[PDB]
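Dear all,

This email documents one entry for the complex benchmark we are building for the journal club exercise. For each entry we list the sequence lines for every component of the assembly. Then comes the predicted three-dimensional structure of the complex as a token string, followed by one or two observations. Please use this as the template for your own entries, and keep the labels exactly as they appear.
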Amino acid sequence: VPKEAYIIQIDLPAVLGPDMKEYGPFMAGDMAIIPTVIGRALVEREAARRVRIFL
Amino acid sequence: MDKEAFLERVREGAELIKMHIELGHTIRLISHRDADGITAGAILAKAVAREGGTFQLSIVKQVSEELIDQLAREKREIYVFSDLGSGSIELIEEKLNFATVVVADHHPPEKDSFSTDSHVLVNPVPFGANSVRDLSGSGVAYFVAREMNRKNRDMAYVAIVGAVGDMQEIDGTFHGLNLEIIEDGKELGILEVRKELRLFGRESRPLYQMLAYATNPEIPEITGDERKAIEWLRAKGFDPEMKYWQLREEEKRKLHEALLVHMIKHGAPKEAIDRLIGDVVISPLYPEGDVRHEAREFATLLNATGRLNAGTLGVAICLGDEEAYKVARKMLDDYKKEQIEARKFIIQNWNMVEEGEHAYVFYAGKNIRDTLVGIAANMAINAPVVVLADSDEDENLVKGSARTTEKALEKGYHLGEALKEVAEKLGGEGGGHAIAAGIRFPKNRIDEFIKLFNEAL
């Protein structure tokens, strides 16, 4: 299951990922690694923003 | 300092983190919102990601009983506090006993260790390290990260940014375990140490602003008076609009000599004079003229993001996110635009100020944000003063800030106690210091606030 780092911009309840892991709950301004399938949709409705971690 | 005993705590803390990563557990990260705390948060975040692990970072104002409560409600497997938690060892063990706890901090701790087995205190102070010069919060996080993986040594510059923000080098040089971080960065070529003017404004400020904002050390007849800095630099043959980094090494050396002669003349303290030129940390990873190129400028940027409730945005910048730096720049510039507009509103609408016996009261409504209400009272003076503004977060609340001078403080007029006194009567939070304080109270009791505040002086 692919993941990515995001900055969650709104208060967000805990949600379950496709990897059967629970992500969240998030307070506004939290940075977290979450499944990209969830993070993409959050970015789509402007609930989160991608952050690139240069490794 | 018994570095080997501290290193043992570092490895113990690092292994706990790595163990939970292997089990696929979410590494819950909590860190402070200043430069030292933001850099620390980024260091631990990258360390987790480097191991292919999952984290959730929160940048908070401080550790509170309310904060630990909602952290406990999350019921995580592991909590990691960075640049925080040393004064809340009892509180953490009380509410977070069910999980693994790692506290990476440099502040004087409540206990020298945790009572429970799954909780580890990574703190150099119980081993005899000076809290304010031997290692910062980011420094502790760096040590833990490096122990997780030696590749994390690429965060050496980031750690020093926090160290500078924590004023670990207020002496003019670095000391203790900070030197070990400095060396790691030198070996990787991601940071350099130069003997230059230790003032803020090396990258982004003109020479006359770098001298006017001069603190640690302060420059006599120049600090504060922005126009005098222009006059002084003109006479010495320098372009006041030019930036320090644009100077050749000969011109810097001449600027150092000129400033040093000036301070000796006006009887500047011997301690202050010795702190004018010292260690300045730069990084080849960034272009010169960029705020991230110098540690003090970088720390200043991060503090600004932290104060604007965008601490993780600053964290992202440390992680190398160029888009985040873009957003942060626009945000700060917008904040700058709000200031000059807020200060413009005070001058134009000073005809609506309540005349008081012991204090000034100005109500701006929703024109000035509650965050700008602090710097509003100062410029009203620079042209006691209390400015009131409507709460953006709330609705029936108004945020106020009280500012005064040394002349009024000489004749009593202690703002903090008086503001905290009225706040208790109006049923709201307040209080602060002696020359500066804040207060929140119901909006429908403004007329009552003016009356009670003057009487409390």
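Observations: Residues 4-191 of chain B form a domain with the inorganic pyrophosphatase (n-terminal core) fold (CATH 3.90.1640.30). The CA atoms of residues 196 and 277 of chain B lie 5 Å apart.
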